[model samples]
Target: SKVSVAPLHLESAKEPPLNTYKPKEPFTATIVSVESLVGPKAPGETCHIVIDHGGNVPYWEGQSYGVIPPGENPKKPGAPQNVRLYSIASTRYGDNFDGRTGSLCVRRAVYYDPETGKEDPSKNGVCSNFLCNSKPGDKIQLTGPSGKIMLLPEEDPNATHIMIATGTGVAPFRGYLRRMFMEDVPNYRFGGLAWLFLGVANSDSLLYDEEFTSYLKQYPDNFRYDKALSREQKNRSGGKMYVQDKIEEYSDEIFKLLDGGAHIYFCGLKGMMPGIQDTLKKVAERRGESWDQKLAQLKKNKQWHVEVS
Candidate 1:
């Protein structure tokens, strides 16, 4: 039997005053549980967190949520506060382990702030950061399901998917994988010839390794995976091997997939965005095609989507 989930509404939504300050309405969700998501060869655990909506709020798989700062009340201000964004790792079909929607897998943001000149951990990243430190019953302010990079379109049984993600970038793809395989959304197939080029700093930091391996085995013809270790592995060719390199190595195959109307979901660090753009441009140039023209075509057809965390 299908369960009806009621929507939780918020009226405080607003546009941000500046690009740096995101204007978003605040809502609340309780931390229901937390678990360690262990990767096959990765070291640190990527935190798989479950947020009980208390009631349903709109969200699409691959979209994101923003956590509002829980600063001390102005009447009792004591410490600084901050807000952070995390992509929704749950499919929109439903919620929780038994439902079409599942938990969210968000890694702890551990990068350093060059501006601050300090390795200040996420001491106050409204939601996940709080989940990192808060008890299971803790409730945090949140906003959004914002993002257009959805995977349901690729649900066509004959369509192909080429996913290139690094670090937390791979989170959304995990959502799609879970929904298609676990929930068995009828007629919503993950289709033919899927390629996932996943990269991480270390083996222990890899996410969904076991599930990925299992799927790859069952669908060897339909699913292909490549793992890139950027930190610990020495680049055999005297240069760091990034996902772009792997793409270049298989440019012929990539072009074939692209020509077939494949969808590419690019995610991870914002810094990697430019590189991906440049690499794709180079690939176009290699084929005597105008890079800008191809890009415009892609945008017109919505064949590409990029997300960063």
Candidate 2:
């Protein structure tokens, strides 16, 4: 028999600090650190960047910040580079556990020649390349504490959180996990499980593994970390394992959790959606449930959250 998880105190979403630093008048933040996030064997590059906003822009766990890189648009002659939004990867208190700074998890987006498989610098993402290559002490323009769609459902600390992510999409979830397990928030205590299904190309692509290991050790029952290392692992059918394939292993349990009000989240590339939806449909049909009705109910109850590139 499962114990009742009704809360004595429900946590509500904090009013998002949207556009605290507006687009045209972006706040200038100094880079505190920029470090490589992937191993030598990992393909491409990912960087973790911390910036000192000096307490001017406050952001919650799952919001995004828009960065204006140093360049004028070629098409518009003198127009500034379009602001690119990156999800904040640090808690509200920042990476230092202080409120003065924030961080972003960014994967350098460079196009490689498909035939030759060589880096093409000219085709790299403008903002992403700038952010990835920035150094400490460099000044950067930033705007927004944007987005409300991905914020945590604070209404129940005991509610299950089933998070599915791929690549750099794990950014916001890092903040959520840090707040849930690491920070000593006097008013909030996460008594429920935070299950993460992270899919990546290889073991080298795993992000925040050290921190997650610590959390797993410290709170065995309250946390679960699952992975789909596509290059290294295989599914039951001998295909490369994907995040959805991992989810399929626990499909029955996942549906039961959803039935019990567990909130599910999906982040990262939109490419991951087709497989996940396919899996979801198959699971629901096996359970004698309507996938259409179940999905609609999730939206109606505000239990389904998504943010993707």
Candidate 3:
């Protein structure tokens, strides 16, 4: 079962619709660089593709842009490939803290061919492949800096932020962290907690290790990083560790944060939600509170933010 509260009306701002840079007439952004986050021989490929919009595309941290790849064949029904939305991985001022560029963390999608029983490049994802292989100076079609649901509430400096992510879902939080620690905003110095619970297959696949570690050291009082490595770690039940397991283990603290007005953000697989909800329910029950009521309260206050795919 799911619950939906009335849309939030906080000091939050929404992005422009894709109609600003529609598929029919999208803006062209030049690729500035593409750097892989994992080792060369890593099991999966993920790259940060930076694009120079030359200040034409103004976007916020939680927004997303659509990438339109050129079609391989004109005769095909869909001449130009459909645009794919990717979460912005950089702050509004971009990676260098300059307002000229932005980036997207892309995971090259490779699929196995059932008939061949092997991975096929031909069957690779269109936008993912295009982005992963894009070179510096290559001009690509782009669209809206859309979305508002996952935006940070900078209005409340005392507001806590609980970020939970897996795989590339960490994209937006990367920006949030940068904005909080790396950049200077007027009247904003995070005084509340900022916790991240990340899930990955192993250390080899861990994203932004150095950056996150730096934040932990710099903001020891406000920041926390917890990882759930499935292959290298085991849960209390001796089963492979997953994000939901970590959620269960930290349920008490999580409940405390929720009761204290912390905003919880969940990004990643949709499957993780059910288990997390169940765990939160159990925690609420232990405290003699209704899980549904607490969840509804969070939603009403716009404290529960979710962006999963």
Candidate 4:
């Protein structure tokens, strides 16, 4: 089901400036929590970490922060550890809704031996491993909560949003969802529909399942949730159900949303873009429309946002 409303015009969005903090003056935040999000049988470690910034470092949703691992960069000589950016998973109000804490949804990186094709524990990702294993009360250095392209359209409360994410790509979307559904920030109330199409390997790998399910329960009229479990779900042709397959399944509704001035966001692996664009192209062609032209229009309107890694 879709909301029937007249076509509306949306203004181009301005990018937010980089935050006050930078790599040179990183904030030393205390870790408040590091809880596992996946079951023991899950493929890898994914944890939700809350960092108390003491209300000093402020950030909006869709920004990312850098974590400087606690050692010298092995690949570099005489340099400090490299900083890795992870999308901030908390809303502008943060996890406590007091603007004092931020959170990160991180997945531990595990590398496989090139020759044996087996996981090489010795080659774990520096920053990811450090963040995943962090404990409460631990202190860590954090940098810029940067990124403006993936921001939500705060001006139009009635604007529709279509979110597509996979794996840890769900990080920014978590912030978006929280801002839209969880908190009641002043001067803002979500008056449009938000559909999330999340792709994962299996049910066990689904991130923020409980929170998203609660959102669906509480905001049923304005929220829709869909999953593409590649390992356990099947498509029409009996192939793996990737995010693209789900997009194709709801192509008509998606196109309608787009035509009605919806904003579409893609935050996942870059590989997902081609298949999704292909699906959109096919749908557009079936309607005697030019997909490329329509896509360009969306971009010009700032209705298309992408943040992939």
Candidate 5:
């Protein structure tokens, strides 16, 4: 019965309710809460924003939300600000596990004026600032529980997920880790390892450290967490410890996982790839394997996913 229902669960996860609300006809949701994700020592502000979806928007773990910010567009008179898609940082059941709330990891943005070389609050990023600085019970237009944003292998409970993220890109993995190690979904009992690599500036800049560590402590066999604190850590060659460097350190084990049909997810800035690509390629060649063929195989199986911004 478990075997029969697992496939059904996976298929159902693949097609959750999509775009119940659109830009033309947006649905309203209230901001349930907002918490600063980083400490004062961190460079900039990163926030964990939770919204009350009111059971109207159904989404999977690795989905995204199209948040329509207020204020008319500066460029267009008739149109409000263009919608920005933010990756969902909570499971379909959300932090409350009620399926009625959603969460996002937002980086508050401020531009540095070229001449002044200081933060310019006036030129702040519209959607990010709006969402980041929101108050509890603040109603905002919401659309999309879209999962093509980061379609995870929620179907295969035995799927090993090798997740790599940087900055706020850690959003989806937050949801993934929650579902894997914390939640108890019927017909979906995760039996595989979830190894996560998150890169950021320092200990103070780490996002969701307590939650991840809690999972790691509770499920040592099922969850593995690593951090690349660039400002506080260094690689073997005495370089800044980026996510790739951390990944490179575990190349042998990662390759083994790949061979075992593990899924690799890359999320964050697009620039995170160059170093990772080269490191992985070098490791593949060092073992007398074709890096080209390995990548081809990974792609052919559709196991390698990049959700970078």
Candidate 6:
């Protein structure tokens, strides 16, 4: 058996390379599907793109990927508009195990540049325009599944889960739902009732209607979903109902969960963060307790988790 055996060549197994640095591959993917979520006034849609990266790279739920524009220069002297981040909506579970079956919920940028007044059609958003105009056989640049905070269980099983989001902010939570249900694991039930309160302009503006409705329908005992349509008000007395407006409706349950040290995840427009923080601060202050002190306690107990990008 030891007779003249030449050196055996071995290639490194490349499943899930944990490279923090962004992938520099200049790849392209064709848009296979597209669906509009809101109207032209709030123009946006969810796109399902298929890429041929020539390799298998691992991607988890709630993480995002970067896309590069075709003609943009990455190392120009000025700020080049090429790359944009998006949460991967498809779960890498069951049939989607290889992360090859990728889907993204993209909110098309409708706001025109103030300086130009004209919608700079020459230099639109990198991923937005790519995903919007891409045909089934077309190709565009793509990069990674990067993020720190993933939708994972806390230290204990009985811990509380509170998620708050606004507008297209509900994208990541959509991924969380797939990860929890599609994957099979031992004793993998979600601990406490997971509360997801989403805010949109109107009933028609909400994304993944049938999907979230299906989650509620399937996991009736473990999940609770609510909506606050800022523009949909049957009665004028309630005023323009935003997400914050509906906080009181669930405050009783929220208070009980807070007592048990809940883990909260919030992702949305950065502008909404201050208002939401101020509202929560006011609530804590009204309870005859120090607002800063109560917030400090929540942080100390790992009860406050926020991701705004």
Q: How many residue pairs clash in each candidate?
A: 8, 1, 0, 0, 1, 1
lDDT leaderboard ranking: 2, 5, 4, 3, 1, 6
Q: Provide the TM-score for each candidate, comma-separated.
A: 0.77, 0.94, 0.89, 0.91, 0.93, 0.79
Better of 2 and 6 by TM-score: 2
Candidate with the larger lDDT of 1 and 5: 5
Whole-structure CA lDDT of model 3: 0.81
Per-candidate Cα lDDT values, in order, are 0.65, 0.87, 0.81, 0.83, 0.85, 0.61
Say what the RMSD of model 2 is: 4.7
| lDDT-best of 2 and 6 | 2
Query: For residues 1-309, could you state the per-residue lDDT of candidate 3 as single tens digits?
Result: 111211122113354333458777889999999988887445689899999987777777788988888884434675667778899888777875567788998988999877986986767888888999999999889988788888788878878999998878889999888878766654456677899888878887788989999988888888999998888889888888887788778888888888899999988667777877876787778879999999999999889999987
lDDT of 2 by residue, 109-189 (tens): 989889998877778888888998999999999899899988887768888999999999899999889878887775668
Comparing 1 and 6 by TM-score, which wins?
Answer: 6
Model 5, residue pairs in steric clash: 10-155
Off by over 4 Å in 1: 1-27, 38-45, 72-83, 93-95, 100-102, 110-128, 234-237
lDDT of 5 by residue, 250-308 (tens): 98999999999999999887888898898888888888999889999999998898887
Which residue pairs does candidate 6 place in steric collision?
Answer: 29-140
Error of 6 at 83 (Å): 2.7
Model 6 C-alpha lDDT per residue in residues 38-77, reported as the tens digit of each score: 6654434444444433334345556666776665465664
Q: In model 3, how many backbone clashes occur?
A: 0
Q: Which candidate gets the maximum lDDT versus the true structure?
A: 2
User: How does model 4 score by TM-score?
Assistant: 0.91
For model 4, the run of ten residues with the poorest summed lDDT: 4-13
What ranking emerges by TM-score with the best candidate at the front? 2, 5, 4, 3, 6, 1
Q: Given candidate 4, what's the lDDT at residue 76? A: 88
